[PDB]
Amino acid sequence: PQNDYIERHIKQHGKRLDHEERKRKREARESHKISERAQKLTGWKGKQFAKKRYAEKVSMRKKIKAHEQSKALPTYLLDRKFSVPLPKVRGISEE
Amino acid sequence: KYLYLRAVGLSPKKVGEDIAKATKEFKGIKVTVQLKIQNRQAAASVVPSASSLVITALNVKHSGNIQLDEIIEIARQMRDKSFGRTLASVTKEILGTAQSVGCRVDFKNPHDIIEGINAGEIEIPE
Amino acid sequence: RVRKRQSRRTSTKLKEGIKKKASAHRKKEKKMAKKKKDPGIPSNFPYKAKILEEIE
Amino acid sequence: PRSKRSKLVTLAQTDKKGRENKERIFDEVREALDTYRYVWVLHLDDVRTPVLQEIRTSWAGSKLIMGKRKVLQKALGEKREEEYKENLYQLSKLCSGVTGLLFTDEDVNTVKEYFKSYVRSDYSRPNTKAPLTFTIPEGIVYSRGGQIPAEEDVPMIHSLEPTMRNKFEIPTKIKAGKITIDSPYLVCTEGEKLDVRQALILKQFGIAASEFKVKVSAYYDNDSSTVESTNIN
Amino acid sequence: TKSLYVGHFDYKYLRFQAIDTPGILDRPTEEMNNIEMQSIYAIAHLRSCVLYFMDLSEQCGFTIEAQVKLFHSIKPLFANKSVMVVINTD
Amino acid sequence: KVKPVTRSSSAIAGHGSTILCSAFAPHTSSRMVTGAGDNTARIWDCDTQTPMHTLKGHYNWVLCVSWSPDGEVIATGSMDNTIRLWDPKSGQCLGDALRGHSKWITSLSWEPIHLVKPGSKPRLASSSKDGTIKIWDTVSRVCQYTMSGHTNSVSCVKWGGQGLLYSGSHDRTVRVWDINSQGRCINILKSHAHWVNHLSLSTDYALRIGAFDHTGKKPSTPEEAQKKALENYEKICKKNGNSEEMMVTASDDYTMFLWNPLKSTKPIARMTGHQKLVNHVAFSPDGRYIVSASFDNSIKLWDGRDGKFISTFRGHVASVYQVAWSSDCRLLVSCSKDTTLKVWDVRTRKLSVDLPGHKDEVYTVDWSVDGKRVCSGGKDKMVRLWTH
Amino acid sequence: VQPDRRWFGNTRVISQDALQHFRSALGETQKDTYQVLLRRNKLPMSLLARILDTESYADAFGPKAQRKRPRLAASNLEDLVKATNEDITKYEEKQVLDAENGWTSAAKEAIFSKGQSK
Amino acid sequence: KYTGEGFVEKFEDILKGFPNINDVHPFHRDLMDTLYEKNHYKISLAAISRAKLVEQVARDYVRLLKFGQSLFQCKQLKRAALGRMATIVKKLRDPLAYL
Amino acid sequence: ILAVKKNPQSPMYTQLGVLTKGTIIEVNVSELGMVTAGGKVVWGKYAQVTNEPDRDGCVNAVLLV
RNA sequence: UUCAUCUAGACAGCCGGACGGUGGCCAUGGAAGUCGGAAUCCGCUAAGGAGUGUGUAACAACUCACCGGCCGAAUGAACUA
């Protein structure tokens, strides 16, 4: 306690012996486990997984797009029957 | 020996006034300084920097009208090391620093004077 | 401990209702329906440089 | 379309050059051949860019063309038929590895004496024995690691202990922010053919105690159109 | 240090607490950072004794004139705080 | 002093699509820019009625043009999100384009000369539909900073004399900005019900000419230009010894408002009477009268002190788009959806001459400074130069 | 619902003078409870800074934290001493003003909530 | 009702667990002010308090659900209540990150 | 809301005041500061509801300008 | 199926280079490519971002982007079914 004590602890002793290898291996196995979760996770969890993956794909597409792209009427007439926006609506029964 | 204590706007006390008396009247700017350190003696003097030399030639802002000859004198001041063949190229090298500072060389942006140089409208005495 | 398993038997009411669902959707799609670029001479064909010669 | 490795894409400014760069180098060497009188081959296998820039600034009149071996081979001519001038593949065949092909109009002996008198300090560059021997002290290791009085230096940064422990295979512990070992690790002996990790250890400790002197093999004169071989280092 | 650090000890069968505070600069005081305002509020609020360390020496990267200047700057906080000065060796 | 305009031009040709914007120079009755429905613009030598310095670089419709009050630079905003600066002598682009906006440009303004420090050039304040107002250092051609307070389109922007920018947007609010406070919004003016069109100021003629009266004589040095423009500004801003510039607004609620934006945040008067919307407003160069052009086939005259009604100019038969003044504050020219221009004597409150000769909707019109020509252009792709 | 030019038009209009007089009379009337309006259905009764723009929750506190100095700053350094002493006195005062050990009070009987019910 | 109760339980754990920056001690008050910007602190916690709105939505939509005459109507009302809750929480993205 | 003028289903429903989809209502607009030529403030305008509020507690509508 | 790279050597691996003005300008207790805001230029180059990430209180060091050496013939991306 008292301040960023674990940051001090990591500076003084340091994280573990088996920390960097394991992190590398987790990052490597994540490619397998992503597909493993796709072919598994029946139901709502699989649906949400697919939603997340689609959103993540769109985000990276837009990021790459932004990278590669960052590499007659007048002003006043621009921005421009007496029928209401809803004639012929569904008919309601008295019942 | 040598150290660099730029740090401006053993015996670590007397080095303070030894540095300040290298910047007595000029500079009042964050210049770079070289300290040749003998036993406990601090022979401290400014090493020329392009940004500081430009800002001498002129939150804070910058608009210079450096007049195209003070930059040439700066290019002569630090064509020493310079890794460059000709003064006509060191001048472009310094005009880039001026562009980053945000100055206004003669009355144009210095990239346009680089255009005039490499196009053949501005001369350099070699 | 393995759990249940859904059944594949079709229980006739369902296949009647599906036939009716599709017979209705076909009419709806036919009603909404009321509202080329030749791909070329594809590569990997070895004798493609000869089709360019019967033109004139 | 699947069970492949995904390429790790990253979004930087620079982009690959392609065949246009090589054609440009080709045209440059071929138009400089007609211009300058003497042309030399320099073997520069492991260099620093400031050393190369010093060599270039030594003469702004003469040219130095680096690039790909096989491109310069084609510009000169590897076959006796395919060649720009006469007896030129005789020179082009000498190119071994990283070749910096120089053009000049200057006397032979100035170049010959310059490129044997020119010598600098450099790292020991593995697959090359080093004329030094280092036992690290058996206490706390410092940024220079047994080269100067420790009262000048500071202990190295704790962030390097995973590197030293795993990649360099040093037995390493740390007591507080300082790195520590129990016994004096010997890294190398003089006349010992160096390996990658020994070289990286000496680089990390900042030891440029190897003599970089550029080697020159051959030399070709346009007016005579003759080759001449002189291994000079 | 960018924060307050606390320690305890027992003196005369009584718990005391010592507080190390990160730092103060001479800073004409209508502009200062949130790290020095910690020190200022701690010195102002608490009912302590207060030990100013001077370090009479060329060390410190700070001159004795600046040290006494800071002391004279922050002595209005010291009006009821039981001050002591310690020299840590013309 | 200024005489009415009677005779036309030939039907001059050039950039062959719809004309959209028009502007005379501030120092000559002979140089005029037009931006068209192609991605180009063109300068014209009015004395000869000849096309000159055709001007490319955009890739969509040129919408807005403006001439620097010193007369050295031209600026063009287009339907693409870019602004391009031009030298009129070369007829060439001055560096690359000044991009940074996300949607098309609506209005432009230049820093008035009497605030520019000597030996420096006037900045460029640009608006845009994306809801932002950018400030460009025109000599380094880079954004100084933006103002991103608004939500909807910014229809108008105006740089005043007291270092203040006034912007009018479709969010029914007029925002004031003290550029000396690093582009901080200080006051927001909320009285309109519909969306704002063509904010205007009292001293904008002076701020536009910048030490260039009806004589055409150029100042010697920028040190003289500062004083010669500052006196022109102060002789009309010191109408009563203390300086005030009036601001007027127009909106699609069939109404204008009149503000003294520093003396008070509330409006003095709400000028009503138009049946359809107001599209263009104009103070007189002397800052005495105000005039409003509406889509109800009408133009209306007001006094620029208390917002009182004077009279109504009539004669048009379709949508009025905009108007312009003479420098003598006696003659008013108006454009319309009909093919006619029309001149109005303001003293007798009467039409002086109806100017047909176009063949379609006339979108832009402008009067020279000295009163020697009026340029007009629209859908018929043929710019006309009507003179006495 | 058929088209009509009578839609899209102002259906209910009022002049400013009548409006303000109507406001005044009813502000007079409807403060007095003994008074009462007669029809009440034909009558129009309907006629009667923020710092987050500057600081973004993230420049204030967090890994980014572009906030080194305060704006809640007193000058004349003795002034914050005068403040701190006043605040400590106020605090000690509130303490004795409003002035646990492992026992509780019994449940409120359910009969006291009988008037209260859906 | 369960969806309402969950949100208000969560928000109450935030409001009661966090300290009142006034009403503590002047020293701690000033310290936490120079650390966390008292204004931002109070503003975030007031945002959460006013969001604890969810009760209003739950009560209103339950009282509306009493008159549901069909499964589709009742389902759409349920969806509407939960969606308005979601909108309220979506408008709480930055204060929670701060807190 | 000020009134209901036209529910397209059986104008009895107008007198009852039923807000079904397509219903046309008078709403107050004094908050917008609309004013006619002459200076008379407008405080009532027609609007058409766009939703079925039996399914949603909201009554969402579009102004008829 | 389409588009690209390739014996003037492609893809993957190791090795080396990865520079100079420059610790570019604002800012700050400190920030040097990498807490942030805005420029984002030139030089020398085979190539080397006023810098892709790890990291340091700040430097350092490592890394990729890009180039070259060894290796010696196919390879990559986007799509459709």
UniProtKB/Swiss-Prot annotation, chain C:
It is found in: Nucleus. Residues 1-44 are annotated as: Disordered. Residues 1-12, 20-33 have a biased composition (Basic residues). It comes from the Eukaryota. Present with 7130 molecules/cell in log phase SD medium. Belongs to the TRAFAC class YlqF/YawG GTPase family. In contrast to other GTP-binding proteins, this family is characterized by a circular permutation of the GTPase motifs described by a G4-G1-G3 pattern. GTPase required for 60S ribosomal subunit export to the cytoplasm. This is Nuclear GTP-binding protein NUG1. It comes from Saccharomyces cerevisiae (strain ATCC 204508 / S288c) (Baker's yeast). The lineage of its organism: Eukaryota, Fungi, Dikarya, Ascomycota, Saccharomycotina. The gene is NUG1. The chain holds residues 2 to 65 of 520 of the full protein.
Curated annotation (Swiss-Prot), chain D:
PANTHER family: MRNA TURNOVER PROTEIN 4 HOMOLOG, MRNA TURNOVER PROTEIN 4 MRTO4. Gene3D superfamilies: 3.30.70.1730, 3.90.105.20. It comes from Saccharomyces cerevisiae (strain ATCC 204508 / S288c). GO terms for biological process: maturation of SSU-rRNA; nuclear-transcribed mRNA catabolic process; ribosomal large subunit assembly; ribosomal large subunit biogenesis; ribosomal large subunit export from nucleus; rRNA processing. The gene is MRT4. It is found in: Nucleus, Nucleolus; Cytoplasm. One of its GO terms (cellular component) is cytoplasm. Coiled coil: none annotated. This is Ribosome assembly factor MRT4. It comes from the Eukaryota. Associates with the pre-60S ribosomal particle. Component of the ribosome assembly machinery. Nuclear paralog of the ribosomal protein P0, it binds pre-60S subunits at an early stage of assembly in the nucleolus, and is replaced by P0 in cytoplasmic pre-60S subunits and mature 80S ribosomes.
From Swiss-Prot, chain F:
Keywords: Nucleus, Repeat, Ribosome biogenesis, WD repeat. One of its GO terms (biological process) is protein-RNA complex remodeling. GO terms for cellular component: nucleolus. It is found in: Nucleus, Nucleolus. WD repeats lie at residues 14-54, 57-96, 100-146, 149-187, 225-269, 273-312, 315-354, 357-388. Involved in ribosome biogenesis. Required for processing and efficient intra-nuclear transport of pre-60S ribosomal subunits. Interacts with the AAA-ATPase Midasin (MDN1/REA1), which is essential for the ATP-dependent dissociation of a group of nonribosomal factors from the pre-60S particle. Associates with the pre-60S ribosomal particle. Interacts (via WD repeats) with uL18 (RPL5). Interacts (via UBL domain) with MDN1 (via VWFA/MIDAS domain). Interacts (via WD repeats) with NSA2. Belongs to the NLE1/RSA4 family. This is Ribosome assembly protein 4. It comes from Saccharomyces cerevisiae (strain ATCC 204508 / S288c) (Baker's yeast).
Swiss-Prot record, chain H:
Signal peptide: none annotated. Belongs to the TRAFAC class OBG-HflX-like GTPase superfamily. OBG GTPase family. NOG subfamily. Associated with nucleolar and cytoplasmic pre-60S particles. Directly interacts with RLP24. It is found in: Nucleus, Nucleolus. Present with 28000 molecules/cell in log phase SD medium. Involved in the biogenesis of the 60S ribosomal subunit. This is Nucleolar GTP-binding protein 1. The chain holds residues 51 to 150 of 647 of the full protein. It comes from the Eukaryota.
